């Protein structure tokens, strides 16, 4: 659910979502790290979890348009840098 930016989440959020108290949540994430479902690292003194990689999943046809738009405004940066580098260093060889 959370975006790639600001993926850090707290213990109390897990406690409320999973309907358990705090003292077990570590073990839960431990299990989630053991079987390789999710990859990350966990802190204890500050009650924070740093989540990094989660398994992919299937999704409908109205969600891939987001990836299409992301490619849309991704290709333009490459094109712009191409043009800038080509024009700036022209006389180095015609």
């Amino acid at each position: 659910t959370r975006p790639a930016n600001h993926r850090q989440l707290t213990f109390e959020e897990i406690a409320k979502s999973a309907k358990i108290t705090v003292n077990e949540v570590e073990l839960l994430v431990m299990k989630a790290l053991s079987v390789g479902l999710v990859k990350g690292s966990i802190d204890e003194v500050d009650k924070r979890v740093h989540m990094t990689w989660v398994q992919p999943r299937v999704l409908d046809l109205q969600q891939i348009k987001g990836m299409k738009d992301r490619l849309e405004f991704w290709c333009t940066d490459v094109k712009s840098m191409e043009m800038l580098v080509e024009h700036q260093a022209h006389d180095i060889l015609t």
């Binding site: 431990m30 790290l33 690292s41 966990i42 802190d43 204890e44 003194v45 500050d46």
Partner: peptide
């Protein structure tokens, strides 16, 4: 292996 910073009591 799994933690990164921990209190001593735990």
């Amino acid at each position: 292996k799994y933690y990164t910073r921990i209190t001593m009591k735990r």
